[PDB]
């Protein structure tokens, strides 16, 4: 049992996300850590943490049982604090669970930068990509260039052979990078007779450098047609409860990076009828707070329902919330 969240009208892009975030215990602990961290010898006091305390207040209530039977919470307080930051919704496509995830993370970085005299920890969704290039003709490679992410936003590939789509396919499609042409190579010492070794073709190599504690994967199901009309991807992408991320590592080593599914945000319907909804694990009890559960839930604003894993895995995922786990035992 978890408490529901009220939604009169346009607030279910936040309810669905809040049910997903509250299913990531590492994100909750980071908030308890982030909202209580400070430095002793500093002379400036820390800037106030309206968002991270409001977000922690909600997510901690969404990771316990409902405090009175069948209670329904009200997260409108969080809408008000996000408007104290730089954010207002202008159009309908900003009522997006993925857009809000970036509005929240971006605003938590504001709270982090706003207390710069005190060490505040970095949030567990943060990770890095590594750009790299290798010369086809001489195997020489470039220094790495870094890029940062809070979610792996994956474009959904077009069908070649009619095999089912997998999260492996969408992830590889995102990291897979092309051959490049007309590029000078210094190990080849090329251009022309101005050096004396064998314009070349490179291969771009994009892989994962820092893998986050909480991994957010986004399927780009909502896009626009050629001529200004909404395009929705309905194709099922097959995902699993346990996810190996070793095939995407930059570093060539044997240590394993493994993730366990915590929640799935789903988008149902189309225009007028469209709705965001969330599958999530049930939170552990105040006894055994440390041992997570294997009973899933389906949460739709004020409505909460028990769900089977077959139901979660057969859904049409929009956001997949994975959390780093060490070994397979469950």
């Amino acid at each position, epitope marked *: 049992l978890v408490p529901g969240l009220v939604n009169l009208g346009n607030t279910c892009f936040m309810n669905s996300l809040l049910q997903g975030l509250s299913a990531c215990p590492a994100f909750i602990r980071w908030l308890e850590e982030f909202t209580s961290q400070y430095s002793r010898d500093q002379k400036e006091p820390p800037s106030h943490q309206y968002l991270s305390l409001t977000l922690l207040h909600l997510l901690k209530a969404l990771s316990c049982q409902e405090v009175t039977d069948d209670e329904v919470l009200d997260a409108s307080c969080l809408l008000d604090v996000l408007r104290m930051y730089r954010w207002q919704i202008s159009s309908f496509e900003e009522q997006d669970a993925h857009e809000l995830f970036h509005v929240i993370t971006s605003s938590l970085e504001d709270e982090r930068d706003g207390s710069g005299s005190h060490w505040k920890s970095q949030h567990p969704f943060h990770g890095r990509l590594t750009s790299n290039m290798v010369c086809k003709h001489c195997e020489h490679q470039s220094p790495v260039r870094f890029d940062t992410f809070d979610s792996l936003s994956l474009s959904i590939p077009a*069908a*070649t*052979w*009619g095999h089912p789509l997998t999260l492996d396919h969408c992830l*590889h499609h995102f990291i*897979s990078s092309e*051959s490049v042409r007309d590029v000078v190579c210094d190990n080849c010492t090329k251009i022309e007779a101005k050096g004396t070794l064998n314009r070349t073709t490179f291969v771009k190599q994009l892989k994962l450098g820092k893998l986050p504690q909480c991994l957010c994967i986004h399927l780009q199901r909502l896009s626009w047609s050629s001529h200004g009309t909404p395009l929705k991807r309905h194709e099922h992408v*097959q995902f699993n409860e346990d996810l190996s991320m070793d095939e995407y590592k930059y570093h060539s080593n044997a240590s394993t990076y493994l993730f366990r599914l915590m929640a799935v945000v789903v988008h149902h319907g189309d225009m007028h009828s469209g709705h965001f909804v969330t599958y999530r694990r049930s939170p552990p009890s105040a006894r055994n707070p440390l041992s997570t559960s294997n009973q899933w839930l389906w949460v739709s604003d004020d409505t909460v329902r028990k769900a089977s894993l077959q139901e979660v895995l057969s859904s049409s995922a929009y956001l997949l919330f994975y959390e780093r786990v060490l070994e397979v035992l469950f």
Partner: antibody
Amino acid sequence: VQLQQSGAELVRPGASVKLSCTGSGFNIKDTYMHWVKQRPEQGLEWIGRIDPANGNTKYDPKFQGKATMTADTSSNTAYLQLSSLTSEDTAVYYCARPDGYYGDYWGQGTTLTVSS
Amino acid sequence: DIVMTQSQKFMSTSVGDRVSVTCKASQNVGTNVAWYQQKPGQSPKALIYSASYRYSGVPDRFTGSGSGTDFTLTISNVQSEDLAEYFCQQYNSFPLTFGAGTKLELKR
């Protein structure tokens, strides 16, 4: 549930041929369909891909000006047309319809032979 | 185009052996390889998709493995049903090229 195919036949080189494939427990309009060539030395070769719901056809560019892919819904049948044949076109030709739970459906083969 | 290269056109096996058929790709094809089985006088049968996922009715004996450019299909606790031709197929890029095919053979 089968993906049934037309029988074999012989023609002289330089002629032109048509092959057929038909469903039996499904409508071919539901999903993409492929044709592939098979012969023992050069192996399996994909020739093209058709979306029977419309006229969209994607080809291997070695076949693009010589093979031709068509279909009809009411007869539940797709056609492969082959032009200006040579001995190198002597092969077995399969249709294929993909499935997500079962393996993809293949039909019984259609052999094609050309010689004087 | 994608060139799919399997190592050996024939491979020997004991009756209860562990066989691994191998394939090398021209470049990174992601996870997008499928493994087919073909007995003589019959049409192909799809076994694995997305490099490692199985279809319905495919025994636990068949393990798909590999990523990007090198791939292997493994048959462990081999059975007398498994003597056949075995192909790989890439569906990352058009054209949807196949491998050369490995006949796996029974040794005495």
